[PDB]
Amino acid sequence: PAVMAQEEEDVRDYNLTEEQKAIKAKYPPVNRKYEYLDHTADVQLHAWGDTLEEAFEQCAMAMFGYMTDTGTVEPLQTVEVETQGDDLQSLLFHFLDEWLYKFSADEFFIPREVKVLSIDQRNFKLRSIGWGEEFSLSKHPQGTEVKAITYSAMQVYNEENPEVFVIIDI
Amino acid sequence: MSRSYNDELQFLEKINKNCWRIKKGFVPNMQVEGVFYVNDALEKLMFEELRNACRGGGVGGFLPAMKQIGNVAALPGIVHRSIGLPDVHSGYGFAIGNMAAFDMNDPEAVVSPGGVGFDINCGVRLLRTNLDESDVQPVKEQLAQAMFDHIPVGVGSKGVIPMNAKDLEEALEMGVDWSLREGYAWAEDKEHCEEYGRMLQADPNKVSARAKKRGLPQLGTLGAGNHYAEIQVVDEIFNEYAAKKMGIDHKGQVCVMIHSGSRGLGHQVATDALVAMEKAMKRDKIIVNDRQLACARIASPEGQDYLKGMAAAGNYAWVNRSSMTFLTRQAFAKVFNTTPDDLDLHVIYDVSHNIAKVEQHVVDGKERTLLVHRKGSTRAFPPHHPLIAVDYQLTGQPVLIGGTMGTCSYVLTGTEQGMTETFGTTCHGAGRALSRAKSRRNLDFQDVLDKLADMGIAIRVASPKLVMEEAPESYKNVTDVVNTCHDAGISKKAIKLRPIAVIKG
Ligand SMILES: Nc1nc2c(ncn2[C@@H]2O[C@H](COP(=O)(O)CP(=O)(O)OP(=O)(O)O)[C@@H](O)[C@H]2O)c(=O)[nH]1
Ligand SMILES: [Mn+2]
Ligand SMILES: [Mn+2]
Ligand SMILES: [Mn+2]
């Protein structure tokens, strides 16, 4: 029951259609443990969880939640993302970047949910999966395009209530 | 950020009415001082950011622009000063509105991709027409809709003109030359484009496969964020000679300002180089105060590979803005049942603000070859400079300054004092006063849409209930920015324009 959010809640409103609203009512809401914090030029993702794995997966879901209303995405396909870094910060960087790439090329995949299956903290390696479908302007509302992940003010806290702070370029 | 605010001010000194000094010690290892140009109204915003960006003694927060200016002043090989321009505000490595120049004959000089930015060669193109406000007012909504229908905007949009991998490979090498060969640009466009719309050292082999896969579907798209295509009306002419060379005849003339960059191809090029440099900063023994400032010696293989891919991403951005120009011309031709040539829809200028350039400058009486980083700031070369298009040799180089969709925009020209104090660098816009997160909370989308309507400005945006994130109050007063540059002598005002229709992604 620890209150990790630093700001009062503020859901972004994507202008759902009746059909988009109906696709969301059809599925179990995804638990949200993230928020969009202040940064003069872009945005700071703040995500948390009970494990480092959950803090990571919520950060990815935060990133996708800035592009569209992920509640309107149907779990029609599953995609895998494995990556590595030299430390927790670069692992987090490459993890978010690999997921961003899944959305920006090839199959243009948008996850309704992301789950980190493992973080190997000795090699700084990660296994994750996401379920969703191909992003479509006829199906999904337009939020903001994410250009890139940055290291600006990146913070990874790996203690009892893990949380991360990431600035992304928008 | 563990110092008290008053302890931070111990490193800050006002130099003159419009300039502050950041003394060494503000952050570790500063090689030169930092400066930022602000008048009284912009000074308050800048110091509030210093106080509030990392207010708490706990976790979270971000780095204020002043700290970033100092971090950049610690980069090896920097000369003169790390310079914040009047629109400066916190970015992600360099500050937004931050210039730094490095001596290419210093073997320790570095190039920082993460400081040039992910939107490589993002820039502004201004077009003119022979239409007047009175010709557009009757069909303002129709024209706003025609722009929106022709120009793909927002996340997930794809280019309407078909492109294959080979076309992209040529566009990366040729820049606007490709658009000309294929019939999407006029010869006059290239003549009034910075660099003539092509950086010759571009090497498509230095652009990764991932960058090419991201870029292909997005070539010919506006993007999202603060990118825009705005129909404007000339409101004031400060320099009749400058206006004449630019084709601006009278107040009331209709122009179009387009702002976009190198899209996913450029974002990826920057990411790839950023990754390659973390892997390489051990060899050359490079220390930085901020991981996002990862860099390499200019002469290293990583540095050269980045510069060549950066140039290719620059060529992509010029191709993208030409596509926006072509589509804008199609929209005007349809609404006014006249060919684009019969509407005099020519390019006044195209200038970029996220790029590193090799330039000749004088440092302490000696002429030097510098690698000039401009993150969110513009080249503004002076009158009689040889590297300016012929039409602007006597006026000085045009600079295109977007304000907001609900205030105004300006055109400026470069000055000799600017060439001397800032290496020919001026502002690129108003800059932000409120984050998007703070705008989402403190402002209502309908209030913003009504205010625009009460001003007679037509609008078409991809996400209408997020438009408060682009509200005019979210940005600095652009007139304070331009007046500070003007009074400082680094830029000279030329034109003032007012928005009447805007499409945003
Ligand atoms: N004429 C207009 N200017 C605008 C508008 N919206 C924003 N801006 C101005 O444009 C200026 C330039 O903004 P930036 O290039 O820094 C935003 P951008 O997404 O392009 O940054 P990158 O991530 O580097 O691509 C900004 O400070 C604002 O003052 C607009 O709707 N119309
Ligand atoms: Mn940005
Ligand atoms: Mn841009
Ligand atoms: Mn820009």
Residue numbers in the entry:
A (entry chain B): 10 to 179
B (entry chain A): 1 to 505
Which of the paper's sentences describe this entry?
RNA ligases of the RTCB-type play an essential role in tRNA splicing, the unfolded protein response and RNA repair. RTCB is the catalytic subunit of the pentameric human tRNA ligase complex. RNA ligation by the tRNA ligase complex requires GTP-dependent activation of RTCB. This active site guanylylation reaction relies on the activation factor Archease.
Co-crystallizing with Mn2+ and the non-hydrolyzable GTP analog GMPCPP allowed us to obtain an RTCB-Archease complex with a well-resolved GMPCPP molecule in the active site of RTCB. Strikingly, three Mn2+ ions were bound in the composite active site formed by RTCB and Archease (left). Our complex structures revealed an additional metal site, named position C, which solely depends on Archease residues for Mn2+ binding. Mn2+(B) is tetrahedrally coordinated by RTCB side chains D119, C122, H227 and an oxygen atom from the γ-phosphate part of GMPCPP. Mn2+(C) is coordinated octahedrally by Archease side chains D51 (a), D178 (e), the terminal carboxyl group of I179 (e), an oxygen (a) of the γ-phosphate moiety of GMPCPP and two water molecules (e). Moreover, H428Nε2, α-phosphorus atom and carbon atom of GMPCPP are nearly in line, i.e., have adopted already the geometry required for the guanylylation reaction. Overall, the structure mimics a pre-activation state in which Archease is already bound but the guanylyl group is not yet transferred to H428 (left). In both complexes the conserved tip of the arrowhead-shaped Archease is reaching directly into the active site of RTCB, thus forming an extensive interface between both proteins with an area of about 2200 Å2. While the Mn2+ ions in positions A and C are present in both, the pre- and post-activation complex, position B is only occupied by Mn2+ in the pre-activation state.
